[PDB]
Predict the 3D structure of the following.
Amino acid sequence: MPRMTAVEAAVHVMRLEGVDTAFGVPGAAINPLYAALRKVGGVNHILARHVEGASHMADGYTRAKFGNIGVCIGTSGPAGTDMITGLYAAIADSVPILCITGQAPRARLYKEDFQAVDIESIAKPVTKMAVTVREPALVPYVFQQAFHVMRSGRPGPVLIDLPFDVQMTEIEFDPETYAPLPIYKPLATRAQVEKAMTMLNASERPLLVSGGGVIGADASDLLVQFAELTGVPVIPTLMGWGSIPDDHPLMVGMVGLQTSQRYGNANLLASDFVMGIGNRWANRHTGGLDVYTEGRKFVHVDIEPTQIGRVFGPDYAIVSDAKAALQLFVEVAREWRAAGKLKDRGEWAESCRERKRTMLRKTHYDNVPIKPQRVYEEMNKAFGRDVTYVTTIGLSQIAGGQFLHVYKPRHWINAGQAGPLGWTVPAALGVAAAKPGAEIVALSGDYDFQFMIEELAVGAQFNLPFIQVLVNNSYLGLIRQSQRGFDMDYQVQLSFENINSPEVNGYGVDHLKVVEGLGCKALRVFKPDDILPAFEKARDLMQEYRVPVVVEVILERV
Amino acid sequence: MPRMTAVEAAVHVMRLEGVDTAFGVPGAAINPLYAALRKVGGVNHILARHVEGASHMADGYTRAKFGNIGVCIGTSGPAGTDMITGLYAAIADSVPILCITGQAPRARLYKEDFQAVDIESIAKPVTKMAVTVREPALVPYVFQQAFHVMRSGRPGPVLIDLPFDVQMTEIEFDPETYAPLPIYKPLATRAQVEKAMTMLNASERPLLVSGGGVIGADASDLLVQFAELTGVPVIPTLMGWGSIPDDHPLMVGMVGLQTSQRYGNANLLASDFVMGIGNRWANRHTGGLDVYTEGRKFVHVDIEPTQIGRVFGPDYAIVSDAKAALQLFVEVAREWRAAGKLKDRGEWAESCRERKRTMLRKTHYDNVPIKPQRVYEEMNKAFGRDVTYVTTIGLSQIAGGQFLHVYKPRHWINAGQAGPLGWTVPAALGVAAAKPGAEIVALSGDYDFQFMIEELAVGAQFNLPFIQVLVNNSYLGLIRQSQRGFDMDYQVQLSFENINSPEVNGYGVDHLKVVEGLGCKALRVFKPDDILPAFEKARDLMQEYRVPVVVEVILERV
């Protein structure tokens, strides 16, 4: 029957819930939680160089491994508003992170105090729960509920706001009998799976769409089991990328976009049947255009067919966690296999492989200045199958062409729905914190890279190596300095004459100098044949010093 | 699979969730739902004479039987804002009701227009979920989610807002494979029950407090088993009243006030240990007072101790549904009994019975004008153990007083925490709709009776008999000197000279004429010895005409 501060009890709860890592910016209002972290022990703290960096580190830490929940800590007032963008990026992708903010003492709550904010109302639209805890005895139970809410239903983030006086009040709490709350998920029934199987087996050219919910539910193995058991080819979404390996025979391409003109990935338009699991349907240009068809039936299996239904009504829908569903689809599909009821898909699957091997654009460009396509081709050569990519690039290409490849679930780590500029660097650091020794490769243009550039120092302080591929299209951009159209274009672009450069230039920021001052290593590449050797030198430097290594590739565009 | 309208699919989901009754006020924007009720059938509609009455009817219908969920239906605009008080009264007592409103078409939805309101924002504070459905294909799934949310966790109300064009739209839906979502509840562990059992057995003068969550979880039988097995006396709260029968040897009083200042329940002040199950401890105004003392240990078992634990923190808490917890407590108490380790409480139980026996007011009033205490004494003689009482009266006594008795769970139907004036009449009508043939007795003063007086016509139209005990303290009239300080007091009281009366009077409203116009039966009582015969004639009139019968008792005050 120990007595302890509410914040010490909060730390016991987090540890009992499996937290051993947190990212944060300390401050006075949240100091009792840090003292409790020191007293209880067992949580490694990684200090961020911006509160938004801590929230994106938490996001990347969650995404790196099923069951992880990144924790993000900040002080009263502006720290909490600094978290809103990271909570939004996470909730938009159904990613849980736990944010904790300090707060002004309770009597000072309803006045506009020195660094006191109504973080509850601001963060409510971007969290599953956001609460200021006004009763000290309730703090452990708010944290316990937080973990239930983050894991249950559609996963998503939570914010807990802690008044300074609440944190230090002594309370009773008993870690030895604490237990986590049960997790809630909707579950598919056998009758629902049997009906979907009847529509699947009735079809001539079935396809499986594998979205982020398959990965979110840790169901990629069952998704591939089901695809192989039925012989049905799979088309991942961007958030589903890597739920089946790109070189798997049943992996027959990616949904390059949704309803954008005549862009077609060939395998979709051939199909008479599409079963989506855990997938969104990206927006239609405000109305039915392409994938929707009277001749193509659609089945949708999702944790919330309570929100995603933008095909204007699937032919059949199942409300289910993707793993619980897929466990049943595999069990039923075996029963149809043993009975000889499954149709043979060998011919249609081989046709899907043919269109995939033909939809190939050449990208071995020798051009100087370097073309972006050459960079991705060299990245595929340089890094192994186990590389984990981190980026917010939603525009890999307009429609069709060489890009990257993904072979394992959660090796494509991308804030697809929100994806702010600056997400990538702190997110890649969170991935490195979750997977020590793993090979992590971020990809950004210079604007994205600059937003949160200072977070590179976090990887130098805590030895969190990863490789940053930095594609810079502002480096060549000519400062024409004739006032016709240049003076107006100058105001909406990144190039300027850097006066610290040896020679006349329009480079803008010297990223190599910035990265070096932040404690990291950097290389610059001007010719396409130097890209791959620079990537290899980056891996060696990374292994040697265990700090981030930036490879800046000089691009043609601006 | 045939297509159906979204609102037709909503009726199929409601029937499949067990709805066969709805209360409502028809209108243009909600009319397609009414057409869907007709075509699908199986749902009996009771028309209310005010939208607020429909919501209190649904409330009473929910409270009458475990598993019921009253449905309240209204049209666009002001009909939605009329539901807020009934939504509030239900959520405050953890009662689910489902409110359904029609809404303006999506084409002019976000813009304000005729009979259109942002009911989503207004109702969010008084619901677990409030949602305008903008996609017709999602309508069945929003209702499926609403039943999950209403039953899960801490139970509570949900509002669903349906634009007119959304209700009309054809969608695909399959009733044959529909299944309800799993219900989420927190669950006590054995180790937590063993530690609580340890604190209980360590004490010498234990008490159980049985609150509304015992009844809401359908756990009164388990609560009685546990008290009988351990020998521990029980003190129900007002919301817990009837979870143990009032004549049970272990029922040793109710909580007389959250803080009866010093006075209090004598058994509570004597106790050294209190275990609350499903109860709320209040703070009458954050009062530092006698409920808690350093020697009295408190254990709290509740579905929601993520917001409750007001005795400045219980010595130990368990987050659990009351039924799941009590099932475990009984099994652990059996093991402790079999091991010979359970303390004998019979001497402690007996002196709690002596104190209960002695702290009664043995007052039988002959007074004319009638005393309210005499009315309660006669209700106790008129009605048997199976009577169901419905009221918001709350303050039966300032500490302990002559009042009613309850013997069965859900035979005390009371909106305690937030009972508005006018709740009682529509709530009793909903109780009557839930339990045809049952004897239902409401109790109200004249102010409360007047708010929703027109709802009595609902009981005449659909033959929903119940007896209304109406205690009228405005009938006698005037105070003080004539036309002096009475002129100010006149403005804040209910008496006036009714000019339609044969004689000089200050009667105010003639409730008998009003009740007669509304199609119901009424009787008036002036002398105490006529109260019981009036109740018995009311029972006969109710059985003969099967419409509400009002017994108006003329009291002393004004």
Q: What stands out?
A: Chain B has three domains: 8-183, 185-353, 360-558. The two ends of chain B are 68 Å apart (CA to CA). The longest strand of chain B covers residues 97-103.
